[PDB]
């Protein structure tokens, strides 16, 4: 029961890795921006020192491979970059584990722009256009992950919504700052636990809420 | 850890073709990335912030490392690699 | 729980000593080790050719 965006009836959990930072650069050769591997390039570009981190979404592979809802099939991952770019992933991509192979998977952002498999029947990674709401299911809950929002158990939060046909969570995969709350889709923010969680542990807490709500 | 002649590294699946095969072992078992991304998850979990957790690790070579809750493990990978080299050879890391 | 940052040197080498930030105490420690090994080798050699 694989899940694309084009069967908007069924019950899904949509994660939106929002305000990501994976950005390409031209050195003959093609690199992408890490804070660790180059800082003089950030200073010459005049960027902020801190927010050139695709390590956060590469660590948020764990919601793609959060097995007891992804091996149930009921999860789907979209990514929206600070460069305004929406990347779909398929719920059966076996993502590259190491960051050097994830660095090598910049052909989706630069060259190939949609990857096939070795037998090449189902597309894995896509560079689709905005908004997210059109690709979401018909009824869809309106949730971003803030900190100073009211805290609630995501078990009870998913359980009290009887059949809202999905649950979408906009998680800001940035270093510092503030996510687009009133800009696009979310009128109410649900806060997770009492501490300033990182993006990866926020996604994992919501994924495990979905597991123990929908009985893995 | 391993020597290059001048340099010390932590054994990856990716920093070498056959340093692991020269040492005898196979390359699939030299994965420090997964204990890195476990250590990140455990030390960003809320139970660690609440102070109800501590993280011990034990290497396949039989080396036990105690990991304080108060530590800030670095977020990228090769920063953690350079941390693990000095931990494995100086047996201690201060703040 | 408070969260401290770990102090460690980048491109660590155990065989080299630590980079002390003073060039007049690291230098005296270097040249103390140098005189100790050269004095030991020197007087070892002169007592064994005396033998």
């Amino acid at each position: 029961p694989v899940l694309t965006s084009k069967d908007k009836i069924t019950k899904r959990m949509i994660v939106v890795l929002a305000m990501a930072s994976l950005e390409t650069h031209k050195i003959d050769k093609y690199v992408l921006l890490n804070c660790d591997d180059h800082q003089g390039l950030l200073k010459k570009m005049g960027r902020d020192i801190s927010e050139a981190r695709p390590d956060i979404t590469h660590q948020c592979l764990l919601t793609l491979l959060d097995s007891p809802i992804n091996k149930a099939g009921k999860l789907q991952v979209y990514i929206q970059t600070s460069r305004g770019i929406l990347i779909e992933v398929n719920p059966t991509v076996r993502i590259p584990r190491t960051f050097k192979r994830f660095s090598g998977l910049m052909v989706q952002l630069l060259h190939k722009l949609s990857i096939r498999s070795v037998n090449s029947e189902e597309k894995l990674l896509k560079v689709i256009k905005n908004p997210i709401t059109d690709h979401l299911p018909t009824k869809c809950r309106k949730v971003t992950l803030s900190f100073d929002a009211p805290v609630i158990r995501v078990q009870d939060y998913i359980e009290k919504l009887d059949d809202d046909e999905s649950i979408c969570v906009f998680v800001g995969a940035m270093a510092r700052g503030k996510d687009n709350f009133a800009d696009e889709y979310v009128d109410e923010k649900v806060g997770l636990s009492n501490y300033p969680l990182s993006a990866s542990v926020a996604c994992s807490k919501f994924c495990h809420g979905a597991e123990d709500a929908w009985n893995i | 850890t391993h020597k290059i002649s001048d340099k010390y590294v932590l054994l990856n699946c990716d920093d070498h073709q056959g340093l692991l095969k020269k040492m005898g072992r196979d390359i699939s078992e030299a994965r420090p990335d997964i204990t890195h991304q476990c250590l990140l998850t455990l030390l960003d979990s809320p139970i660690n912030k609440a102070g109800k957790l501590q993280v011990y690790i034990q290497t396949s070579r039989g080396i036990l490392i105690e990991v304080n809750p108060t530590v800030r493990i670095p977020r990228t990978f090769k920063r953690f690699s350079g941390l693990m080299v000095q931990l494995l050879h100086k047996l201690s890391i201060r703040s | 729980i408070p969260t401290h940052a770990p102090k460690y040197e980048e491109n660590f080498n155990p065989d080299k000593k630590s980079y002390d930030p003073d060039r007049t105490r690291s230098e005296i420690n270097k040249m103390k080790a140098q005189l100790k090994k050269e004095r030991k080798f020197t007087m070892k050699e002169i007592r064994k050719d005396a033998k």
Binding site: C35, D36, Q39, S50, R53, A175, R176, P196, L197, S198, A199 | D44, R72, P74, R75, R79 | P2, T3, A5, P6, E10, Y19
Partner: peptide
Amino acid sequence: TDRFKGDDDIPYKERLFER
């Protein structure tokens, strides 16, 4: 207090030497 901000970079020896 490091709320996911990451521990900072430390300048290299040659970068501090070029001064």
